[PDB]
Subunit: 295 residues, 4 copies
Amino acid sequence: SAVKAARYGKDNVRVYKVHKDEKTGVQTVYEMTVCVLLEGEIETSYTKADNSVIVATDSIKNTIYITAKQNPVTPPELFGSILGTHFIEKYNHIHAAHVNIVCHRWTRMDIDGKPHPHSFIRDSEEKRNVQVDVVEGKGIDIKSSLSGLTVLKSTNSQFWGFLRDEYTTLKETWDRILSTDVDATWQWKNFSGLQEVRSHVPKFDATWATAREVTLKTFAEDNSASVQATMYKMAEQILARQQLIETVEYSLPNKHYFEIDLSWHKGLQNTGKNAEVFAPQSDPNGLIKCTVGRS
Amino acid sequence: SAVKAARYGKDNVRVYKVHKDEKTGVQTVYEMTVCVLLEGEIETSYTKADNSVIVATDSIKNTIYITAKQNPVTPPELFGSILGTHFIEKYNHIHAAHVNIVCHRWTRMDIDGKPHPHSFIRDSEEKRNVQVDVVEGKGIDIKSSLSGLTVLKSTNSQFWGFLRDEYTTLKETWDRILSTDVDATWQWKNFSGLQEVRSHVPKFDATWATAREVTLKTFAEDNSASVQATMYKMAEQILARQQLIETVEYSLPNKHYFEIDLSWHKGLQNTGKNAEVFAPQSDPNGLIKCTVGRS
Amino acid sequence: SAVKAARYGKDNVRVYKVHKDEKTGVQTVYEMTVCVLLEGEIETSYTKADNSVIVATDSIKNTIYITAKQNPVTPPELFGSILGTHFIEKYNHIHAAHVNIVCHRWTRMDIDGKPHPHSFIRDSEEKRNVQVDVVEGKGIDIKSSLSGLTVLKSTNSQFWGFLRDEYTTLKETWDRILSTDVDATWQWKNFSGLQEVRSHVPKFDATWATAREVTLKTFAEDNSASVQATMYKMAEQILARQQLIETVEYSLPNKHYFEIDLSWHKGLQNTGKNAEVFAPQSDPNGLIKCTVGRS
Amino acid sequence: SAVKAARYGKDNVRVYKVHKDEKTGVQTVYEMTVCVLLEGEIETSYTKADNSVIVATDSIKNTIYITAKQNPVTPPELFGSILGTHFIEKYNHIHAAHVNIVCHRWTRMDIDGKPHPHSFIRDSEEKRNVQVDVVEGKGIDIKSSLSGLTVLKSTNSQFWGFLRDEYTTLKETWDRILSTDVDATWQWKNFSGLQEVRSHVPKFDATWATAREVTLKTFAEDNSASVQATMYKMAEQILARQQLIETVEYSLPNKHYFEIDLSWHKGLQNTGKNAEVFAPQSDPNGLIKCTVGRS
Ligand SMILES: O=c1[nH]c(=O)c2nn[nH]c2[nH]1
Ligand SMILES: O=c1[nH]c(=O)c2nn[nH]c2[nH]1
Ligand SMILES: O=c1[nH]c(=O)c2nn[nH]c2[nH]1
Ligand SMILES: O=c1[nH]c(=O)c2nn[nH]c2[nH]1
Ligand SMILES: O=c1[nH]c(=O)c2nn[nH]c2[nH]1
Ligand SMILES: O=c1[nH]c(=O)c2nn[nH]c2[nH]1
Ligand SMILES: O=c1[nH]c(=O)c2nn[nH]c2[nH]1
Ligand SMILES: O=c1[nH]c(=O)c2nn[nH]c2[nH]1
Ligand SMILES: O=c1[nH]c(=O)c2nn[nH]c2[nH]1
Ligand SMILES: O=c1[nH]c(=O)c2nn[nH]c2[nH]1
Ligand SMILES: O=c1[nH]c(=O)c2nn[nH]c2[nH]1
Ligand SMILES: O=c1[nH]c(=O)c2nn[nH]c2[nH]1
Ligand SMILES: [Cl-]
Ligand SMILES: [Cl-]
Ligand SMILES: [Cl-]
Ligand SMILES: [Cl-]
Ligand code: NA
Ligand code: NA
Ligand code: NA
Ligand code: NA
Ligand SMILES: [Zn+2]
Ligand SMILES: [Zn+2]
Ligand SMILES: [Zn+2]
Ligand SMILES: [Zn+2]
Ligand SMILES: [Zn+2]
Ligand SMILES: [Zn+2]
Ligand SMILES: [Zn+2]
Ligand SMILES: [Zn+2]
């Protein structure tokens, strides 16, 4: 036997950071969950009980805190790049660092129509994430995403013209509910190192905002032929609006809402044009995926 | 042996309803999860295999749908009252109906600064709930609540002057983080029946709004001496602003954020006035509860 | 306004304890999650920012650890009684202590047919719990339970003879699946204090075992007329086998498994006597409850 | 823009199947959750609203049921292979089918020391899984796994000799707790098609049993130098015992149990050799991964 692949590190590291403006009194908070996995010349820890090659996962945890103390934690693309670069530079025998960051929402509260200086609300379980892979000699590969963006439209979704054979019972429809949890990822051009990541810093927040805006507007406005057709429109628009992205990927569940035939009860009409009350289905769900790149 | 208490019904019934304005084209959606448990002269179903006294839970489910089709589902206090009243009136031997409703958020999307007619977003896992107990001959008892309202303030929370003995290690503080998930319940005066509930319908949405507004403003503005002291202020204000409530109850976790001493690493200062990076603690958590009524 | 009720403490306190037999080398582990809430003359912490009456929740946490170090953690009825008694005795102004313990399974592994001295497996998310309320001047009230015991029988469950009216669509059946998650609670006679609890210590493990055995055997062997009828049989047997219990309570979901009509596909027969493949339903679920006491 | 990758299908399809032996009366149950995603000449569904290429996800769901009715559902490697082969054979334009199956435990109950003919218990959330990728012209690729196997040993785990620098605070130890949730995957040699999968059917259950047995015995018996060293031993043994496997992969969290220093309280000794009571840590956790293949 031999080690074909190995990585190890610390997962589920919760991190909060506050910034306090001394002049204005305004405070701003950031909260994340971080995972860091390292690769390199570490196989002997597995094969020979050689712990000398192990940067302890506890030490990786310490390093996350220390790095958060001494550097910006936003945008997460930057923080992840700094953190991953640290491991490959500090340790000769560590040659890759994989850094995943889930960013949690702490949106500043408005009280009586004014933004409060130090109070925040979790508006939504929606996350902003990054996966940053820093590979020695091969730069920094960043995948940015939004996830857990849960939406529903009550009309202007259709699904007809699909294949019909002896396995098919689904009725064609020209007016259905469409609900999903959006998971959208944009893959950046490889960056050569930290300097290049830093040179593009404003683009990270701007591109997250573009992706979110395009997703919401396209979902709301597209008289959808299918989940497939709608998600493709989202992806093509995002690519058109950020040249430093190479691909956009969507993974969308179709969270079904079924009509309920009540006509057995006093002829009550609740289907088709008369459908008012529906049964949200927890499972199963359609799952529709696409990765779109440039022609 | 004998039956001392019994109730049965259908739980976790997901319900969506849409309203479509024909004139304007504006659609509005509602989504809930419902549980209904019935009580009455049903003991023989337990003791003698007498199913004749059982209104099948499947039929209870059907009835939830039918009732949602033929009645308003908002405010939930009203829907729950209608539904519970149905069971005790329809079935001579059923003498109480317990109806719990969890309302899920589907907030209308704004696209390009305009409210969209049929697209919605789940902004937050915060719920609005009701527990409605309809008891034959004893009216309708309603407990309204908000839950899952997750907030954080980064300063203007204190905790000092607590009991100190040989079990105490906690340091006094004049500046800490405070974060919680608000669960707040207001208990209405008993209503004599459906007519009286209907007569107060506007008060239900208004009182939920008051409770939420008071909670957020008090949390944001109170230079808090403790969770106890802050929650009491919330409750007293809500009672002062709705005379038809008898009590307000809060249940608040203290979701701790611990300082991280980094001074072992190059003398890095991250405690006290220099605290920037914190460790959010998943567990354990303080749990602070109060029920406040009128003097 | 005035405080009508108040309690506070520390929740979700994870605790592990190991016992090591020096002679044999056999180690035994225990893992729990504890919550402790205190009541007493504490209202001024809410109304006047008087923290002097607060035994800090952090100190309550310390006390849980210390008490676990110096006392048995098994049976949980005993540990909870010791812990709750400590708070009301140590603090003059604390008059009630509510202690909930969830016990997690760490079952000793068998390796090559022999019990291993220090390796354990979580066989099942089933829990054994206690709720212990120690009230100064009013003894110790203990509710013991098992929960999360998930079972299924593939036949010998029936449901017919239920009420049929215009809300009813459910077909009678003489052969269905029955699956549930058992939550069963036995309420002990009030104990006067710790001495009396200690005097009955062996009965706690014995009665948990009886409750579990009766539950499983009755579920397996009863040709069930309904969930109601089966659960009542369980409760009556447990009461008959422990005179120091006053009531037994069950709360059972009916976790439905629906037939799937496939006859639209090449006349495939999968209903009634030919039913082989079923659709487990995540929601909704029946919920059936009973509390049984002595005649 | 252009589609670079696309797949779609139905996820979270719950399936139960019962087998009834007419002669003996013994019934046996199987429960799974299935996902199926298809690939092929489907890009126009995304780019041109061409639904004619879509086998509806609803139809995929029907097909899962139908296939379960007409074929064995065990071992899951076989069922997944049959199901995936169906899609690529039935639909000319579908060229790959990805089938994931999570198998849920329904272990036959023993009542009074005898196996019951039709009653079952969920002993453990441990799963047995398969990922089966059927690719037209390229055979069938199967990854088998066990997951959610949660274990703890109370001694005979060590961790010393790791790298120590200015980021390191972790103390070396020669006696700690080790607890993990085992996720282990064995990757089979490519199979040319269904005939070859069928020819190896007995090996699937046998190899799952070997993997589980090796995992448990090695965990229990290895005086572990690290998670890395222990998991490697597991993998090498499994490879040695099934020549039709190419690799074994483990992903193991190190679910930390921290000592609690109580010496501030009356000099209580609870560290090192005196450690009895520990604080299980929910997060963060080490995460250790390896893929082992043949030299
Ligand atoms: O790459 C990762 N992505 C994730 O979403 C994640 N979550 N935990 N760890 C993770 N690593
Ligand atoms: O948008 C949809 N895409 C699909 O592929 C599908 N299949 N069933 N329903 C569907 N809806
Ligand atoms: O839920 C899922 N998400 C995915 O991205 C995926 N890929 N394969 N199977 C999958 N299931
Ligand atoms: O009274 C209830 N409250 C709840 O929060 C709930 N959830 N399920 N059922 C319920 N019943
Ligand atoms: O607000 C608080 N209340 C308490 O009762 C407490 N105990 N520890 N910390 C605390 N913070
Ligand atoms: O989490 C909890 N919430 C409560 O309301 C409560 N009451 N007792 N114990 C409790 N634990
Ligand atoms: O009394 C309680 N029962 C419980 O099940 C529980 N869980 N957390 N706290 C709790 N308190
Ligand atoms: O056992 C059952 N009890 C009920 O009350 C019921 N209602 N529908 N199905 C049922 N099954
Ligand atoms: O899920 C539930 N369990 C219960 O015990 C209960 N009581 N009321 N509603 C309830 N819902
Ligand atoms: O390939 C998959 N693996 C999984 O574990 C899974 N879960 N859902 N879908 C899935 N697909
Ligand atoms: O087994 C372990 N492996 C590691 O890599 C590690 N790091 N800290 N603790 C550890 N324990
Ligand atoms: O929890 C995780 N599991 C994994 O397999 C993994 N890979 N990268 N990050 C990861 N995080
Ligand atoms: Cl779909
Ligand atoms: Cl607290
Ligand atoms: Cl039921
Ligand atoms: Cl680790
Ligand atoms: Na390096
Ligand atoms: Na009645
Ligand atoms: Na006292
Ligand atoms: Na094909
Ligand atoms: Zn991770
Ligand atoms: Zn990761
Ligand atoms: Zn309920
Ligand atoms: Zn309820
Ligand atoms: Zn609790
Ligand atoms: Zn409790
Ligand atoms: Zn899937
Ligand atoms: Zn999958």
